[PDB]
From a paper:
We solved X-ray crystal structures at 2.10 Å, 2.15 Å and 2.20 Å resolution for the two BĀN- and one BĀN′-based designs, respectively. All confirmed the three-helix bundles with up-down-up topologies for the B-Ā-N/N′ helices. In addition, water-mediated hydrogen-bonded layer of Thr (A) – Asn (B) – Thr (N/N′) was present in a clockwise design. In our case, the core packing of the parent design consists of eight layers, with three residues in each layer. All but one of these layers comprise solely leucine residues.
This gives core-packing rules, including layers of hydrogen-bonded polar residues, which are combined with surface-charge patterning to design complementary sequences for acidic (A), basic (B), and neutral (N) helices. Synthetic genes for these express in E. coli to yield soluble, monomeric, and thermally stable proteins.
Author numbering: -2 to 95
The structure:
Amino acid sequence: SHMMLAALKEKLAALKEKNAALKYKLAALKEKLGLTPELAALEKELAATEKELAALEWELAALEADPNPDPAKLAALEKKLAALEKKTAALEYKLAAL
């Protein structure tokens, strides 16, 4: 679970960095293409992913401070981060196609 926790922290950190980077790419698309509803949908999704990542970070913090972390909480965190990785990959593609 130590290895598990350490790995989830690195995954979370990489998702935060990728998601922040996509905010600058989206803003550049907004300057280039104007205020389309398509870009509005991508901004909303980027914001939601950042919100979810912030919430998960609080749960990771609690588990790190726990002297015997619940394996179920760890597994649930692992699943949620896996979902956000896919969602962030799909957004990376969509911004690259615009």
